[PDB]
Structure 1
Amino acid sequence: RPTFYRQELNKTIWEVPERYQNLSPVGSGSVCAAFDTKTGLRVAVKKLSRPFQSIIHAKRTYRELRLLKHMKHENVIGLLDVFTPARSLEEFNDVYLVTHLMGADLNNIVKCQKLTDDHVQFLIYQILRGLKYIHSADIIHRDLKPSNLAVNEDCELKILDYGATRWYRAPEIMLNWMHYNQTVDIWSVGCIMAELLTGRTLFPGTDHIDQLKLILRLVGTPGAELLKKISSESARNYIQSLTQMPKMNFANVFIGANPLAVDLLEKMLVLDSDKRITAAQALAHAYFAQYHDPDDEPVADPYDQSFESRDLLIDEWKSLTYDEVISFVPPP
């Protein structure tokens, strides 16, 4: 066990190994930047907020650790370290997660820089590349947005989840469809890409209902073949109540964009989640011809998610989380 030192950052208490120094708050779980004395690189340390307060927090904590420990991809957050100041399972109450500090997030990059088409190609390719991997483990991000994308000075990108958000969310979520295919993340990609192309939020809704109305104005109210799939009659005529919108021609919306980008946007921003391009299909799209390599777009090892169906006690979840901390092997 390393020696742990205590500190206070925004009234919050931080006990970390001496390995990490110059802790400076970045986010509020709360996130600090730090200097890793072992490797000489800048890291980000997230302290989990009250990780075992309820059964639901506790399962979420286990979920987070298990997830991060599995992610081993260039375009997805990777775990460098996980620690607790506790020496036993009995004292165990805090969890800290360590990852490589990429200098900025995608929102704080697009806030001034007008990106070129080549930027869009490369940034979107990377998002789709990490998503191909995430999807292959049967994981859905569910909250993809520019603030959940870390970018370095080479415009290399990693997908993570730091934990309006609605601006990038699939319409079938905001209407609790329940199901969700993995192309909910593809909808979010379309929203991001559109914004990288125009420099403007695509659907900047003021609230939940404005969000949906802005969406329908672009993509149109549901076609016959979509309505054909709606099990619930309540839902079916709630939809058939809303103003009947024609689908917009995207070429007439993204006026000066690369016609291949417009074509890809059309395949991503389809209302019917069954008709949406997948991550793997999108990688093979001609828009990314300069970046696509079918032998360097890897998929994930099998990910055992059976815990998700389990209903356990706080101490059980807590205990399983502790085992995962102890058994952690850092990357090379």
Structure 2
Amino acid sequence: RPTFYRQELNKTIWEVPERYQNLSPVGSGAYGSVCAAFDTKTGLRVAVKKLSRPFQSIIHAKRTYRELRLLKHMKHENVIGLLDVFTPARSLEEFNDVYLVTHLMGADLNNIKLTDDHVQFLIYQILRGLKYIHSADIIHRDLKPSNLAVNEDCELKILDFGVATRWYRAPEIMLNWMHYNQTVDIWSVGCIMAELLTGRTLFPGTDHIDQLKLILRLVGTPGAELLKKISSESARNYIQSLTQMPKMNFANVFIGANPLAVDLLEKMLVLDSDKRITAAQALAHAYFAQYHDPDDEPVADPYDQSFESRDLLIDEWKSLTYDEVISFVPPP
């Protein structure tokens, strides 16, 4: 067991191994607070997240377990990786805090209108990481610029920090379709890619109705083939009662963009999710000709998310989380 030290940063107490020095707060959200630190063991700058109230409720405890399981699985250049996970607890009985450590990245895409060469490389990386994530049967569901960490070298990693999320959300999610697929993430990437090219939010909807309205203005109201797939009477009544609109010509909307970026946007932002390009297909699109290497776009080990269906007690989720802390093997 490392020697731990304690301090207070912004009304939150931090108990971390002495390996990590010079903690400075960088931000805080609903599910944690984050510090930058220097990792004396590796010489790396790192980000340390202290989970907030990880075991307060069954719900929290399951969310904690979910986050740790996911982070322990991710082993890809374009997805956040876990460098360390620790707790100051010496036994299960006293276990009430979880800290996660990852490489510190310069900034995020929300901080960062870009050159086309930069767009190619950034979107290539997002899709490369998505091919990986999707191959594990995981859907990110909240892709947006602030969830894309980018260093000064333009290297990019997908994460979730857990600008409205709804702006990047697929139209089928606005409609509350229960059976959406992984291409909800492709929709988000199309929205991000548009914004990088234009410097403007593609669909800055004020609420879910407005969001759908703005979307359909670009991509057209549903065609007959898509309408046949809609099970909800009320949704069909609503959609069919709209003034019908054709799909816009993207070449005109994205005036003066690389025609290949236009073509890829068309393939990502098709309204019917069944017709959208997949991450793996997108990597092979001519837009990424300078980056694409089929022998360097790996898939993930399978990921068991059977736990999602389980209803367990707080202490059981806590013990499962503790098991995962203990079994953690740091990367080489």
User: If the TM-score is normalised by the length of the shorter chain, which range does it land in?
Assistant: over 0.9
1:90 to 76, 89, 93: 93
Structure 1, residues 71-108: CA drift from partner, whole Å, max 9, x if none? 00000000000011111111111111000011111111
Name the stretch that deviates more: 302-311 or 117-126: 302-311
Structure 1, residues 217-250: CA drift from partner, whole Å, max 9, x if none? 1111111110010112121112223332221110
How far apart are 1:205 and its partner, in Å? Answer: 1.5
State the alpha-carbon separation in 1 of the partners of residues 247 and 76 from structure 2: 37
CA contact (8 A) 2:47 2:104 kept: yes
State the alpha-carbon separation in 2 of the partners of residues 101 and 250 from structure 1: 37
State the alpha-carbon separation in 1 of the partners of residues 308 and 191 from structure 2: 29
State the alpha-carbon separation in 2 of the partners of residues 239 and 21 from structure 1: 57
How far apart are 1:54 and its partner, in Å? Answer: 1.4
State the alpha-carbon separation in 2 of the partners of residues 139 and 60 from structure 1: 15
Structure 1, residues 49-70: CA drift from partner, whole Å, max 9, x if none? 1111111111111111011001
Alignment of 1:14-25 (within 5 A): 14-25=14-25
CA contact (8 A) 2:84 2:100 kept: yes
How far apart are 1:43 and its partner, in Å? Answer: 0.3
How far apart are 1:136 and its partner, in Å? Answer: 0.4
Structure 2 runs not aligned, ≥5 long: none
How far apart are 1:22 and its partner, in Å? Answer: 1.2
State the alpha-carbon separation in 2 of the partners of residues 67 and 148 from structure 1: 15
For residue 176 of structure 1, give the secondary structure of its aligned residue in structure 2.
coil
Structure 1 runs not aligned, ≥5 long: none
Q: TM-score, normalised by structure 2?
A: 0.97
For residue 95 of structure 2, give the secondary structure of its aligned residue in structure 1.
coil
For residue 52 of structure 2, give the secondary structure of its aligned residue in structure 1.
coil
User: Identity of counterpart residues, as a percentage?
Assistant: 100
Structure 1, residues 141-192: CA drift from partner, whole Å, max 9, x if none? 0000110000011101000001111111111112210122100000000000
State the alpha-carbon separation in 2 of the partners of residues 225 and 143 from structure 1: 28
For residue 317 of structure 1, give the secondary structure of its aligned residue in structure 2.
helix
State the alpha-carbon separation in 2 of the partners of residues 107 and 10 from structure 1: 25
Structure 1, residues 115-158: CA drift from partner, whole Å, max 9, x if none? 11110110000000000000000000000011000001110100
1:66 corresponds in structure 2 to 69
State the alpha-carbon separation in 1 of the partners of residues 202 and 214 from structure 2: 9
2:255 corresponds in structure 1 to 255
Matched length:
328
- What's the Cα RMSD here? 0.9
